[PDB]
Amino acid sequence: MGHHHHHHSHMAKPTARGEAGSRDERRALAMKIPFPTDKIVNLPVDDFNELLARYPLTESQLALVRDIRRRGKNKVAAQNYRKRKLETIVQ
Numbered sequence: 626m627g628h629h630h631h632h633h634s635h636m637a638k639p640t641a642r643g644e645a646g647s648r649d650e651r652r653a654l655a656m657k658i659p660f661p662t663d664k665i666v667n668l669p670v671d672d673f674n675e676l677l678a679r680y681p682l683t684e685s686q687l688a689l690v691r692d693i694r695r696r697g698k699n700k701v702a703a704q705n706y707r708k709r710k711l712e713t714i715v716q
Contacts, residue, residue, distance in 0.1 A: 647662070648696075649662035649693050649696060649697065650662060652689060652693060653693075656685070656686050656689045657686070658680075658682070658686060658689070658690065659680050659681075660676065660680060662693050662697065663697065664676070665690055665693050665694050665697065666693070666694060666696075666697030666698055667697075673694065677690060
């Protein structure tokens with residue numbers, strides 16, 4: 626009976642990338658964000674609000690964008706950090 630000799634062709638596509646390997650980058654491509662994480666941080670609240678409304682994002686995606694905005698901004702907050710002290714009782 627039909628001992629049919631099967632055939633398969635071989636292909637090869639080169640994934641030419643140039644990334645630094647940042648944390649938020651993996652967040653974006655996983656939750657499928659159509660705009661860069663750095664832009665989310667560096668843009669002001671005005672442009673940021675429109676940036677969200679312009680792109681087809683879910684409530685979960687928007688939730689991520691709101692966090693990433695803060696994650697990158699926290700690096701600037703490290704310089705703009707409000708210094709204080711809680712009156713600690715020593716022995």
